[PDB]
Design brief:
Keywords: Allergen, Antimicrobial, Bacteriolytic enzyme, Disulfide bond, Glycosidase, Hydrolase, Secreted, Signal. By secondary structure, the protein is mainly alpha-helical. It contains four helices and three strands. Helices cover 30% and strands 6% of the residues.
């Protein structure tokens, strides 16, 4: 599924991500824009052979099991395939664990490089929320 901007903002809010760990909803929308372009089926292979999955490009190194990342953990206790669903519940639940891990949203390198410090409210501007 390819979400619209305000449609994803609404889905993230419904799943309790708005101001989760003090990150406003525009921070989450901005991260999703630059990680996946709002596509739940987004995948990206890393040079180390881990893979990033879904709207927030969650990595198999630590967070999900894909059976092909030697030495990796599955700290969200999910198959990485669950992160590709039209239903964002698994991605949101896992992102809550990631952003609690100690470096906040810096875990998302696209957030640090493209969202952090910017006018992230623009990402929810005009949305009925
Ligand atoms: Na893994």
């Amino acid at each position: 599924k390819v979400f619209g901007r305000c449609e994803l903002a609404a889905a993230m809010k419904r799943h309790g991500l708005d101001n989760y760990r003090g990150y406003s909803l525009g921070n989450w929308v901005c991260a999703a824009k630059f990680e996946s372009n709002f596509n739940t089926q987004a995948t990206n292979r890393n040079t180390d052979g881990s893979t990033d999955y879904g709207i927030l490009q969650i990595n198999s190194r630590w967070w999900c099991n894909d059976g092909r990342t030697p030495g990796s953990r599955n700290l969200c206790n999910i198959p990485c395939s669950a992160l590709l669903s039209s239903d964002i519940t698994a991605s949101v639940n896992c992102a809550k664990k990631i952003v609690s891990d100690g470096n906040g949203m810096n875990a998302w390198v696209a957030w640090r490089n493209r969202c952090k410090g910017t006018d992230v409210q623009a990402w929810i501007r005009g949305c009925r929320l």
